[PDB]
């Protein structure tokens, strides 16, 4: 009954994932990572520490976000001891955020939360943010209480006016205030306020949270952006960079002012334009067109092939692990189907199928 339970749990997961839709999602993103050094995360119920796995899993999320969404920029606000602090603003450089993260790892967490203060300076940080740059904040919380210098509802309405969507990730259980926050922040949706159950589910929550979010019609931002690629030149001399003014062997040229910069994806510092490459924009085409799930055929029918169409391994008999792409009508094994849906972004069976 183990395979039957696995099949019915996969059916529940498939019922959750039936809504495969090509929604327009948040691409030009601006993120704020609200963190807390409070005394609640000192508890050794988590091994070695709540703050410990917060540190490593935050580093992992930084890497995953800079990979999956390179063109976006993310900031870090730290809560500690009655007043929140800023350690990393929004940047295309993950190195600064990583150095701040390991500085927080070196230091000790202690304090008590002021979520109104955190939200207020987060509002100040997202204040000079362009309209196409979507404003989103991630929230972690290890407690059940927060004192604040003033009322929170004016802040709530003001941030709703600032057109923001926010996910909140609590530690213990659901809190009505945070539920209301995600509700009003996310147009009545309360799927944005989720609580973990263990570290595996926690990491799964991170892996979900790296992904972009679909956007609505009513908050329409249909416009154009003035983009331009730089030209990398492998130069023969140590040369000054525009930003840090240090001598570099080679690098890029600005498409307009011909200045050089250390890294991509970054804006120009001089004529002030976003300079990316084709990798950054190609990174989300699998968002732009998704990959619909593959038809797991039953063992009752006769099959076109009894071995895998892709990895070329023989199919088993009690259950039929022959998973057929509807866009290609070729059955594949569970291993290849899971790997293609998690990594790959084209069906070789559909490459075989002529159109």
């Amino acid at each position: 009954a183990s395979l039957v339970a696995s099949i019915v749990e996969a059916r529940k997961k498939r019922t959750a994932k039936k809504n495969i839709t090509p929604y327009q999602r948040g691409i030009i993103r601006s993120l704020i990572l609200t963190l807390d050094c409070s005394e609640a995360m000192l508890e050794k119920d988590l091994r070695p520490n709540r703050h410990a796995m917060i540190i490593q899993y935050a580093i992992d999320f930084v890497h995953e976000f800079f990979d999956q969404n390179p063109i976006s920029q993310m900031g870090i606000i730290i809560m500690r001891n009655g007043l929140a602090q800023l350690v990393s603003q929004v940047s295309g450089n993950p190195q600064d955020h990583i150095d701040a993260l390991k500085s927080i790892r070196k230091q000790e967490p202690k304090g008590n939360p002021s979520l109104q203060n955190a939200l207020e300076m987060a509002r100040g940080l997202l204040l000079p943010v362009p309209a196409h740059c979507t404003r989103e904040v991630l929230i972690v919380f290890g407690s059940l209480s927060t004192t604040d210098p003033g009322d929170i509802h004016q802040t709530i309405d003001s941030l709703v006016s600032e057109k923001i969507r926010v996910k909140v990730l609590g530690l213990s259980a659901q809190v009505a205030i945070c539920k209301e926050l995600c509700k009003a922040t996310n147009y009545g949706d309360e799927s944005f306020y989720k609580i973990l159950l263990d570290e595996t589910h926690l990491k799964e929550l991170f892996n979900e949270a790296v992904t972009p979010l679909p956007v609505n019609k009513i908050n329409k931002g249909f416009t154009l952006v003035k983009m331009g690629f730089p030209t990398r030149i492998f130069e023969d001399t140590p040369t000054f960079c525009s930003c840090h003014s240090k001598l570099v062997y080679g690098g890029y040229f600005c498409p307009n002012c011909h200045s050089k910069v250390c890294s991509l994806p970054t804006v120009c510092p001089c004529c002030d334009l976003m300079l990316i490459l084709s990798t950054h924009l190609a990174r989300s085409y699998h968002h732009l067109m998704p990959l619909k799930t593959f038809a797991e055929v039953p063992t009752t029918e006769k099959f076109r092939s009894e071995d895998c169409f892709s990895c070329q391994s023989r199919f088993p008999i009690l259950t039929s692990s022959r998973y057929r792409c509807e866009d290609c009508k070729q059955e594949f094994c569970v291993d290849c189907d899971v790997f293609i849906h998690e990594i790959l972004h084209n069906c070789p069976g559909c490459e075989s199928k002529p159109v």
């Binding site: 059940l144 213990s172 259980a173 659901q174 809190v175 009505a176």
Partner: protein
């Protein structure tokens, strides 16, 4: 309620946690043509009742009017109070049989 009975035929009686039913036609000289009870056909249980007869120290607990001022059992009770105070997300209520006894225990607790 007797003039209510002889004044109105369609006298219909309901409540939430009236269990059992039989002593109410005893305490009130009446009868019903029919009476039963209803329990919900809920999907999964979301109210969680359990009976605690002992603290984490495994000490028997009671609120009798004689042993109400027993400081060891008081300390056990406040250990429970501490442990729900650490974990309460939104709201939590405690009742006692007698308000004087509440004021006594809360007075010495604050003390």
């Amino acid at each position: 309620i007797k003039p209510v009975f002889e004044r109105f035929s369609s006298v219909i009686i309901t409540s939430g946690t009236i269990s059992p039913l039989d002593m109410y036609p005893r305490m009130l000289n009446f009868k019903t043509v029919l009476q039963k009870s209803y329990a919900m056909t809920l999907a999964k249980k979301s109210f969680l009742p359990m009976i605690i007869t002992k603290g984490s120290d495994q000490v028997a607990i009671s609120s009798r009017f004689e042993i109400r001022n027993d400081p060891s059992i008081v300390r056990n009770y406040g250990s429970m109070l501490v442990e729900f105070a650490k974990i309460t997300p939104d709201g939590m209520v405690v009742f006692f049989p007698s308000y004087l006894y509440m004021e006594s225990i809360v007075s010495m607790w604050q003390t």
